[PDB]
Request: fold
Amino acid sequence: EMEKEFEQIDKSGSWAAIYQDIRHEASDFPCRVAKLPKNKNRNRYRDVSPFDHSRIKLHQEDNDYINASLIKMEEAQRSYILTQGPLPNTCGHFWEMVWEQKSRGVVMLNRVMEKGSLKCAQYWPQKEEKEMIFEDTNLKLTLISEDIKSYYTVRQLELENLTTQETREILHFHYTTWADFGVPESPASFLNFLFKVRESGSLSPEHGPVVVHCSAGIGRSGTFCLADTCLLLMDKRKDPSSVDIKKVLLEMRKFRMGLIQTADQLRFSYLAVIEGAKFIMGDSSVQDQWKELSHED
Reply:
């Protein structure tokens, strides 16, 4: 039981040792494309790169590189694209990826400005009447509407391929109070947000993989994906005891390095999965309780 092990780790005060064990066991695969000289200005962080085997390729002749990884969870049958916060020169690439991969939702777990520094380009329009055109990838992006809550904002965007005039609705789920190298305010607040993404249809198999990013796309992004996958696995046979969280994280780390950046994020991941199990195991009313506890307005 993840709960029985959670209590053991807490009593031992061994979250740091557990977390370092995962670091030591994690997969190591080449990132040769990411390290090519011509891609240096496409990477936000020197030490966060996509593995070659799992990287998303842009469908263009010139340079197909974007710092983005396809995390394909075979047993859970869910996929995610994890990517860095777009740079000023990679916003067109970012939306090209969204188009080519047929994603329906973008989950953003950071703010543009965090700890007095710019963590992410302003890659979507903040005003309906000021749309964005990405000339390098021939895409147009319009803000359609916005639903602002206390700690998160949901936006409806229209993405248009200008070459064909095809248009798609993109949902943007923006968690605005989650500090880098931090944890959410509560399991309830995090799960309320996760179930909002789930409820929108953005995670469903008829769409492309959801795009998840923070600044580097590994820490907060890893926490989000790990909790979601763990809850989905539990859902499939109604068996909380069959879910080994550490092994799920290690499986995810076969597809992108560094997922979950602190021991307390790992610890939080356990808390979120343990609490979310109440919903999975038949207590539907807990979802309402999360929404109230989250004080979203």
Notes: The chain has one domain: 1-297. The helical segments are 2-12, 15-25, 91-101, 187-199, 219-237, 245-252, 263-280, 286-293. The first strand starts at residue 55 and ends at 57.
